């Protein structure tokens, strides 16, 4: 697992061809949001403060990338 | 009590008998018919 501290680098990673899927994790106790993209070798995580612009980053993310919100319970 | 050898089972893990509850409340002086423990008792 790798952490990305640059929005531009995260945008290029999400536009890589091997980016199979993406998910959004919300931590309201910490008041943060996490964008996790699943590539071939590494899972890349971008950590942001919970904000409207952090929500609008979805619009800058590519459309063909299947993005989903993490549920409260990881049901097996 | 047998606390030297084993712990007492918690009261929440054992379901109480309605007859015993009504008998204890009657001995304490509470009218069980006026409060209706039959509806509160499960099956």
């Amino acid at each position: 697992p790798q952490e990305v501290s640059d929005i531009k680098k995260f945008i290029e990673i999400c536009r890589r061809k091997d980016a199979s899927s993406a998910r959004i994790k919300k931590n309201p106790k910490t008041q943060q949001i996490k964008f996790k993209v699943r590539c071939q070798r590494f899972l890349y995580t971008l950590v942001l403060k919970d904000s409207d612009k952090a929500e609008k980053l979805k619009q800058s993310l590519p459309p063909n990338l299947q993005i989903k919100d993490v549920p409260k319970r990881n049901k097996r | 009590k047998s606390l030297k050898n084993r712990a007492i089972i918690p009261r929440k893990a054992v379901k109480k008998p309605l007859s015993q509850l009504e008998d204890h409340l009657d001995q304490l002086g509470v009218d069980t018919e006026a409060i209706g423990l039959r509806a509160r008792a499960q099956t």
């Binding site: 501290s5 640059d6 929005i7 531009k8 945008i11 290029e12 536009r15 942001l48 403060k49 904000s51 612009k53 952090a54 609008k56 980053l57 619009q59 800058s60 | -």
Partner: protein
Amino acid sequence: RRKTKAERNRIKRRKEEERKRKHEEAMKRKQQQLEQAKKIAAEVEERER
């Protein structure tokens, strides 16, 4: 001259202070990039094209 324990503690305190300032400034630049994320996406699009 040989320094004192108070001077050593002051030097140390400046070291964690500058580390904290670097961390805060990195958080600020990340927030600014998040604010200007759409232009960044357009520039990435232009470079790929």
